[PDB]
């Protein structure tokens, strides 16, 4: 047993940041990583996702060329080119992340960690044992897929991970899911040329977002040429001569169900969920708690039920975003190594952006979450809808919707939701303001920047 | 003399908003406009400027096409097309602005107003007389041009107004000026294909901005192919067989001066200044104060030295931006018609964006204005510089610089300056935060949005 001051399991967003902050404070740390550092985000997430998005944004502006006075292009995108490059960038970052750990004196135990029987919290990487007064489990999660039992042929399709392995553009794409990943994959594949279909169990996507967003987002998808199959779901999948044959059942309320075969499908992508990566950790040896789905149960301070063990990031289940994982590891490191008993992450007013077309920006309470916590009498919402002046000279259009949810008489801005061009870089600023507890008066007392879309939030009447 | 409750002179940004807010409060208002409503901003400013910018942004992304897997285009932009459209949009807006005044019951005295001899403040539009207990002068300004006396041939060139009259792209462009307009014109003409030169009296542009900006902005201009002629200035201009011949004098400190002839110049654009539009108003009949340059002198409440007369917008000289003009007319209307003695506009922390390539965003104190008002011991600046991941796969690059100026021990964020992709839509949010009096801790306690450029401001260390 080599002893350390900190032993982080998983070198993803959460593990790395916590280790970095701990080392900065004096601790002798080591990180246990079974694969590539940078985790899900760098290797199969944020990074490669956003590169492919910047590419989709390009095809969509090839369509506005002639309107702007330029001669139009003949087409034919090449997936290989942009893939080789996307992959290279991910290599450049790995190298970078290795270097940082090294120059920071953070040891890297490479391999798969699992807990042991030793009473004192101890893990064992490759027959060898390591222990520490503080162990952070930050192993994340993975895309869930349906068992061949209920969906015979389910394994025939791919996941987001497999999307980043695609080497040529799928001719016919069918995506099953209604969350941000699902939406993003559908938006990228469709803009780049694939005949795409998004299969959802209901009528709208991102149903957990403010109604104005799920409504607008389902619409803009339809308007962009993505076939949305509502109240539909996969019954089975089969490999035919030319691609897969997907049989789905559509049960639109008020009507009788209908079976449908989607043939010649090159790509069936499961974007149905993320499952925690916790079995093989041998949590059962310490009685470490988990919920019915395997997520590790922690408290406000990221504490498991076992002393000297913590969990952060996706593995916990709450707020599946890289900067939440980071913020939690950073705050933990400070509580442990800088002794600030009160360093926890406030999970309220976390900003999120969904890179669809147009981009979605959202922070805070939805109108309903607001109505519920305050009451209809005390919730006033303000909102606008317009066509960005960028579309003033284009046949093509996309709208821009902005809702502002205010609570009580002072009108504390408790939620801002929007969808439109520029909404991705537009949010961080207001997120700070919302986090400071701004009121509608503060926004209104801020001089506008003309001409911009952002200026519509400081002139909402 | 027809009497009203409010008589606004000029239907631009400031006059229109003040009239609208006044009418909403009960006042019987009328607006006096000698030309097209919407003013400088709609007719020869913000609106047409930003359309031409969106177009320049397009040529600059035609250059990243092949990098993103798409086949490249043969070129040849067409100025006519985008002009007909830009002009049409401006017509659509005028019509809109007319309609609003009408549906709001604001009368429109069309023609040129001038003050009279009548003791009681009275103006006369076309032989007819109008008076009111409250007159707002919101006549704005105009591009200044050099007198043929000192610069023989100065009149041969055009101004920003004349830029919006151009019907074909200038082959060779030379722009004289170092402010935002100058920079923007140079950036648009150059991106769209003109062989451009920007003539400045010093070494850098936007010299009144934070040093990191004038430095970065002079650099990115050079890197984009805009020839910047430093310590240079026009001596005279002449019309030759093929375009104008510009003779300038370059006096770089440490060296002897050199005369230079720039020949074959199709366009010489004066972007040297804006002069107030106040002579023909006959200010002298009421003894209304003005500075040595004709700007009308007002106080914190927009009061002239004469009772019942006010001034807002460019005409005053302070903060030459549409939303400052608007904010001042709106606040005035409330002071006058809603009787709130304390409604004045706070001229501190006004956000501004300069649509160069890449866009500049800035709000607050520059490092020096901070150092001066607080002292070197009390000013801490934070800053970063990086290449946006959009350029991770492009031969072409543009940087992104961000400086954060903090004052005192709490580190109140008193100034944020940046230049880069997305910085135009990125600013409004932080401007609200800065206006609320945020500290570096507030920014740091805001969860980041990954991956974005905006996220670099909440992780500045
Ligand atoms: N504002 C100053 C602080 C930010 C410094 N970035 C350097 C300037 C960019 N230079 C450049 O030349 C361009 N930058 C990039 O190449 C990298 C790629 S991923 S690196 C971005 C990084 N990651 C996270 O946000 C997510 C956690 C991550 N481990 C994961 O799982 O993905 C972040 O900033 N971490 C805070 C922290 O943990 N670490 C901080 C350092 C980031 N790690 C690597 C930086 C260099 C890139 N490998 N940065 C990003 O894409 C995000 C930042 C964005 N501004 C951008 O640059 O596009
Ligand atoms: N968030 C709700 C409040 C904003 C409402 N805009 C309508 C939604 C956009 N719909 C759409 O379909 C697209 N909008 C546009 O066509 C117009 C063109 S100029 S109109 C923008 C306007 N002007 C000023 O900022 C500058 C003063 C001006 N008189 C000048 O001199 O230029 C502003 O919002 N004024 C506050 C106020 O005085 N008046 C408010 C109404 C604006 N006047 C005209 C609106 C319709 C366009 N004619 N708006 C803009 O370009 C700026 C807003 C920006 N979000 C955008 O839409 O691009
Ligand atoms: C497609 C797709 C797109 C996404 N886009 C975004 C986005 O734009 N923005 C965003 O904020 N988030 C995005 N996410 C979410 C983000 O990837 C995750 O929330 C973030 O990765 C969480 O970090 P973590 O520290 O819990 O995990 P991870 O990054 O998953 O890191 C865990 C690491 O632990 C290693 N590991 C696991 N078990 C062990 C073990 N026993 N021993 C050793 N090593 C082990 C893993 O190999 C991995 O490298 C996306 C996710 C997917 C999938
Ligand atoms: C090129 C260029 C680009 C610009 N870009 C931007 C930008 O992106 N953002 C921004 O914020 N600002 C920009 N500006 C600045 C913005 O145009 C002005 O600050 C804004 O127009 C100020 O409004 P105002 O009410 O004082 O004036 P104005 O809009 O100028 O309105 C005054 C009106 O008064 C009328 N008038 C004048 N005298 C009389 C009289 N005696 N009788 C009757 N009518 C009269 C005029 O014809 C005019 O229509 C730009 C300016 C130029 C020039």
Per-domain residue ranges of chain A: 1-143+273-348, 144-272, 349-461
Instruction: Tell me how far apart the alpha carbons of residues B33 and B260 are, in angstroms, rounded to a whole number.
Output: 44
Please give the Cα distance from A144 to A272 (Å, whole number). 7
Other Cβ atoms less than 10 A from the Cβ of A76: the count is 9
* Helix, coil or strand: residue A435: helix
- If one counts every other C-beta atom within 10 angstroms of the C-beta of residue A459, the result is 15
Query: Which among B327, B401, B404 has a CA at the least distance from the CA of B365?
Result: B404
* The ligand 4 atom nearest the CA atom of B326: 25
Which tokens hold the place of A49?
Answer: 């996702």
**Cross-chain Cβ contact B458/A350 below 8 Å:** no
> Which residues from B are below 8 Å from A55, CB to CB?
68-69
Correct CATH for B144-272 of 1.10.10.10, 3.30.1300.10, 3.50.50.60, 3.60.20.10: 3.50.50.60
DSSP B71: P
Can you tell me the distance from the alpha carbon of A160 to that of A271, in angstroms, rounded to the nearest whole number?
7
Residue A451, preceding peptide bond in cis (omega within 30° of 0): yes
Q: Which residues from A are below 8 Å from B390, CB to CB? A: 54
A&B contacts, CB < 8 Å: 244
- Cα distance between residue B80 and residue A371, in whole Å: 52
Q: Is A322 on the interface with B (CB under 8 A)?
A: yes
Ligand 2, closest atom to CA A459?
Answer: 1
Nearest CB among B78, B443, B449 relative to A427 is that of B449
Does A427 contact B429 at a Cβ distance shorter than 8 Å? yes
Residue B361 pairs with which residues in a beta bridge? Answer: B353, B418
Choose one of B358, B389, B443, B461 to mutate for the ligand 1 pocket test, by most ligand atoms within 8 angstroms of C-beta. Answer: B389
DSSP single-letter state for residue B217: H
Length of chain A: 461
Ligand nearest to C-alpha A350: 3
Give the Cα separation of B401 and B387 in Å (integer).
9
**What is the rounded CA–CA span in Å between residue A368 and residue A371?**
5
Chain A residue with the nearest C-alpha to that of B323: A448
How many angstroms separate the CA of residue A92 from the nearest CA in chain B? 10
Nearest to B446 among A67, A86, A432 (CB): A432
Residue B53 sits at φ, ψ, to 5 deg, of: -70, -45
Q: Using the beta-carbon criterion (under 8 Å), do B324 and A447 form an inter-chain contact? A: yes
For chain B, report the end-to-end CA distance as a whole number of angstroms: 65
The gap from C-alpha A90 to its chain's centroid, in whole angstroms, comes to 18
Min distance A458 CA to chain B CA atoms (Å) = 8
Radius of gyration of chain A (CA): 24
Which of A324, A431, A447 comes nearest B327 by C-beta?
A447
- The CATH number of the structural domain formed by A349-461 is 3.30.390.30
Chain B stretch 26-85, residues whose beta carbon is closer than 8 A to a beta carbon of chain A: 41, 46-47, 50-51, 54-55, 58-59, 61-62, 64-65, 67-71, 73-82, 85
Query: Which chain A residues have a beta carbon less than 8 Å from that of B350?
Result: 447
Rounded distance between C-alpha atoms, residue B341 and residue B353, angstroms? 32
Strand partners, B268: B174
What is the DSSP secondary structure assignment for residue A249, as one 8-state letter? E
Give me the helix-helix angle, A13-24 and A322-337, nearest 10°.
30
Identify the CATH number of the domain defined by range B1-143+273-348.
3.50.50.60
B76:A71 CB<8 A: yes
Q: This structure's resolution (angstroms)?
A: 2.4
A101-131 burial, b at 16+ Cβ within 10 Å, e below that, comes to beeeebbbbeebbbbbeeeebbbbbeeeebb
Please give the number of the atom of ligand 4 that sits closest to the Cα of B111.
Answer: 43
Q: Which of residues 252-281 of B touch A (CB under 8 A)?
A: none
- Is B432 in contact with A442 (Cβ distance < 8 A)? yes
Residue pair B272/B144 in contact (Cβ under 8 Å)? The answer is yes
A393 closest CB neighbour out of B80, B89, B430: B89
SS3 A433: helix
Quote the DSSP letter at residue A306. S
- Nearest Cα residue to atom 47 of ligand 1: A93
Given the CA of residue A39, which atom of ligand 1 is nearest to it?
Answer: 31
Longest dimension (CA), chain B: 73
Distances (CA, A) of A390 to A2, A15, A421, A454, B111: 61, 42, 9, 14, 33
CB–CB of A458 and B65 under 8 A? no
Instruction: Tell me if chain A has a CB within 8 Å of the CB of B428.
Output: yes
- Mutation test of ligand 1: which of B383, B384, B385, B386 has the most ligand atoms closer than 8 Å to its C-beta? B386
| Angle, alpha carbons B63-B65-B69 (nearest 5°) | 150
Q: Which of B71, B426, B432 sits opposite A458 (nearest CB)?
A: B432
Pocket of ligand 2 (CB under 6 A): A 384, 386-389, 450-451, 453, 455-456, 459-460; B 12-13, 16-17, 38-39, 41-42, 46-47, 93, 96, 322, 326
Phi, psi dihedrals of residue B117, rounded to the nearest 5°: -85, -25
* Nearest chain A residue (CA) to B423: A425
Give yes or no on whether A144-272 and A349-461 have one common fold. no
Angle ∠(B353,B359,B362) on CA atoms, nearest 5:
40
Technique behind this structure? X-ray
Are B407 and B378 spatial neighbours (Cβ–Cβ below 8 Å)?
yes
Instruction: Give the distance, in angstroms, between the CA of residue A412 and the centroid of all CA atoms in the same chain.
Output: 28
Does residue B416 belong to the interface with chain A, where contact is any CB pair within 8 Å?
no
3-state secondary structure of B238: strand
Alpha carbon distance A106, A37 (integer Å): 13
Measured between beta carbons, which residues in chain B are less than 8 angstroms from residue A50?
Answer: 389, 451
Q: Alpha-carbon distance A377 to A109, whole Å?
A: 57
Distance between CA atoms of residues A305 and A300, nearest Å: 12
Compute CA distances B66 → A56, A57, B157, whole Å. 13, 14, 39
| Cβ-based neighbours of B402, under 8 Å, separated by 6 or more | B383, B384, B385, B416, B417, B418, B420, B456, B457, B460
Number of helices (H) and strands (E) in chain B: give both, helices first.
11, 22
Tell me chain B's radius of gyration from C-alpha atoms: 24
Pick from A40, A52, A61, A69 the residue to mutate for testing the B interface (most B CBs within 10 Å): A69
Task: Verify whether residue A450 is a known catalytic residue.
Answer: yes
| Nearest CA, atom 54, ligand 1 | B453
B249–chain A Cβ distance below 8 A for any pair: no
Round to whole Å and give the CA distance between A437 and A28: 39
């Amino acid at each position: 047993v080599a002893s350390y001051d900190y032993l982080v399991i998983g070198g993803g967003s959460g593990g790395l940041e916590s280790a970095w902050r701990a080392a900065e404070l004096g601790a002798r740390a080591a990180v246990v990583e079974s694969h590539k550092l940078g985790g899900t985000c760098v290797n199969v997430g944020c990074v490669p996702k956003k590169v492919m998005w910047n590419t989709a944004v390009h095809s969509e502006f090839m369509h506005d060329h002639a309107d702007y006075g330029f001669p139009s292009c003949e087409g034919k995108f090449n997936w290989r080119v942009i893939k080789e490059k996307r992959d290279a960038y991910v290599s450049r970052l790995n190298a970078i992340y290795q270097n940082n750990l090294t120059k920071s004196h953070i040891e890297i135990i490479r391999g798969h960690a699992a807990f042991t029987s030793d009473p004192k919290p101890t893990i064992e990487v490759s027959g060898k044992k390591y222990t520490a007064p503080h162990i952070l489990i930050a192993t994340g999660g993975m895309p869930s897929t349906p068992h061949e039992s209920q969906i015979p042929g389910a394994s025939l399709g791919i996941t987001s991970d497999g999307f980043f392995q695609l080497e040529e553009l799928p001719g016919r794409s069918v995506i099953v899911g209604a969350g941000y990943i699902a939406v993003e994959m559908a938006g990228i594949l469709s803009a780049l040329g694939s005949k795409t279909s998004l299969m959802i169990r209901h009528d709208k996507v991102l149903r957990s977002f403010d109604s104005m967003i799920s409504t607008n987002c389902t619409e803009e998808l339809e308007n962009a040429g993505v076939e949305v199959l509502k109240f539909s779901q996969v019954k089975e999948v089969k490999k035919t001569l030319s691609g897969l044959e997907v049989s789905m059942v559509t049960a639109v309320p008020g009507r009788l169900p209908v079976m449908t075969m989607i043939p010649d499908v090159d790509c069936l992508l499961w974007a149905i969920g993320r499952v925690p990566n916790t079995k093989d950790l041998s949590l059962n040896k310490l009685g470490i708690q988990t919920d019915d789905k395997g997520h590790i149960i922690v408290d406000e301070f990221q504490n498991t039920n076992v002393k000297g063990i913590y969990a952060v990031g996706d593995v916990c289940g709450k707020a599946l975003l890289t900067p939440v994982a980071i913020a939690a590891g950073r705050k933990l490191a400070h509580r442990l190594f800088e002794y600030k008993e009160d360093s926890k992450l406030d999970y309220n007013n976390i900003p999120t952006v969904v890179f669809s077309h147009p981009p979605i920006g959202t922070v805070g309470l939805t109108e309903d979450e607001a109505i519920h916590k305050y009451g209809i009498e005390n919730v006033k919402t303000y909102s606008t809808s317009f066509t960005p002046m960028y579309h003033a000279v284009t046949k093509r259009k996309t709208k821009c919707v902005m809702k502002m949810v205010c609570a009580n008489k002072e009108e504390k801005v408790v939620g801002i939701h929007m969808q439109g061009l520029g909404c991705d870089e537009m949010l961080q600023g207001f997120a700070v303001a919302v986090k400071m507890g701004a009121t509608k008066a503060d926004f209104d007392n801020t001089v506008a920047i003309h001409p911009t879309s952002s200026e519509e939030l400081v002139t909402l009447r």
